[PDB]
Amino acid sequence: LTLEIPTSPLIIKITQQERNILSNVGNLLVKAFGNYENPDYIASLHLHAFQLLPERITRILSQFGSDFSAEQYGAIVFQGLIEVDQDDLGPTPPNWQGADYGKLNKYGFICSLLHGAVPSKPVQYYAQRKGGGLLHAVIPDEKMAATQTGSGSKTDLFVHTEDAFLSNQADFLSFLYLRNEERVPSTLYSIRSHGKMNPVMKKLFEPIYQCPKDANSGPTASVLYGNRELPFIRFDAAEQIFNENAGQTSEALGNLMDFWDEAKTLINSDYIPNSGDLIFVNNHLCAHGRSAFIAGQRIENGEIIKCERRQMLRMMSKTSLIHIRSVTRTDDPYFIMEEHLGKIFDLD
Ligand SMILES: NCC[C@H](O)C[C@H](N)C(=O)O
Ligand SMILES: [Fe+3]
Numbered sequence: 001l002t003l004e005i006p007t008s009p010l011i012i013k014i015t016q017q018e019r020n021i022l023s024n025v026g027n028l029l030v031k032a033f034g035n036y037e038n039p040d041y042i043a044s045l046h047l048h049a050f051q052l053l054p055e056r057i058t059r060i061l062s063q064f065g066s067d068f069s070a071e072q073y074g075a076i077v078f079q080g081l082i083e084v085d086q087d088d089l090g091p092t093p094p095n096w097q098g099a100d101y102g103k104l105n106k107y108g109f110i111c112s113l114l115h116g117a118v119p120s121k122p123v124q125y126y127a128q129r130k131g132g133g134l135l136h137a138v139i140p141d142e143k144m145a146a147t148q149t150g151s152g153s154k155t156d157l158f159v160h161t162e163d164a165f166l167s168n169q170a171d172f173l174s175f176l177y178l179r180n181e182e183r184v185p186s187t188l189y190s191i192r193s194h195g196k197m198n199p200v201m202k203k204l205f206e207p208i209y210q211c212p213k214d215a216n217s218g219p220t221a222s223v224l225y226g227n228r229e230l231p232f233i234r235f236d237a238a239e240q241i242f243n244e245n246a247g248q249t250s251e252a253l254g255n256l257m258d259f260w261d262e263a264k265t266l267i268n269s270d271y272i273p274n275s276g277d278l279i280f281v282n283n284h285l286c287a288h289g290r291s292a293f294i295a296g297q298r299i300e301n302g303e304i305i306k307c308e309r310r311q312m313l314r315m316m317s318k319t320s321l322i323h324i325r326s327v328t329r330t331d332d333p334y335f336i337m338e339e340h341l342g343k344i345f346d347l348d
Pocket of ligand 1: 096128129138139148149150151214
């Protein structure tokens with residue numbers, strides 16, 4: 001019978017036994033490898049992922065990695081993946097630069113294991129903080145309050161797939177919420193929520209769209225690619241549509257406007273992540289964002305509740321080092337040097 005169109009992500013309630021295993025597995029890996037960027041750990045990542053993760057998590061992620069069917073949302077919420085000791089974590093640093101990665105080391109092991117079970121290899125992009133490592137602290141900055149970045153707060157972060165301007169954008173993403181006391185909803189948008197291929201969607205297969213770099217003669221790409229009936233997406237609502245300098249053709253902007261009108265009714269803002277929740281996303285199916293918020297506060301019965309500022313950890317991964325090899329550093333096949341749709345950063 002009828003197709004069952006996904007409108008929300010799969011919600012997995014992590015158990016106390018699973019939390020405890022992940023903690024003690026994380027603690028063992030820190031003692032064994034020191035840090036999650038250790039080359040000996042990375043080379044044997046999939047082995048540790050499949051051997052050390054709780055069975056149910058491994059099944060969920062293994063199934064998800066190869067699932068591009070009509071019923072797949074392209075996002076999983078792992079509720080209560082970790083217990084965050086808020087007093088040990090201490091105050092949120094002023095910016096991402098202030099993050100203590102010694103503190104976050106266990107979290108980066110746990111996150112890399114989740115990517116390893118897909119299977120997928122964690123990667124870093126020069127397009128993102130000159131690399132910034134395999135794990136990124138996403139903290140609101142007062143200086144970059146009304147910006148279209150993770151460092152943003154005061155404004156809503158319109159739905160986007162990560163790095164729509166790169167031909168070698170992340171395959172999978174994980175967002176580990178350490179703190180979300182402001183109670184900011186995590187917005188998600190799946191191309192699968194559209195259902196069957198329609199004429200509005202078909203126009204997005206044309207490589208007539210500008211994909212500008214993060215907040216004239218640039219190269220163009222297709223918004224939809226992959227299988228013609230069940231496609232993959234590269235989309236940035238703020239950079240491709242709502243940016244004056246997008247440099248779109250009238251035909252291209254119209255097709256993007258027509259698409260946006262359909263897509264915006266499908267955005268899911270129902271999920272407000274709690275501390276210790278992780279959102280695992282297939283970056284080719286599901287776009288992400290987050291609503292506008294005043295960092296360090298929430299409002300209850302018309303009263304301002306001051307709180308600790310939002311703190312989230314982002315990890316990105318690629319399922320094949322082979323494909324991206326032309327754009328990665330010679331001395332590091334996990335470091336992507338791509339700047340814009342095939343073009344590589346010219347440093348000297
Ligand atoms: N559109 C991606 C932007 C990143 O989330 C944030 C950026 N690296 C920053 O934290 O300054
Ligand atoms: Fe993003």
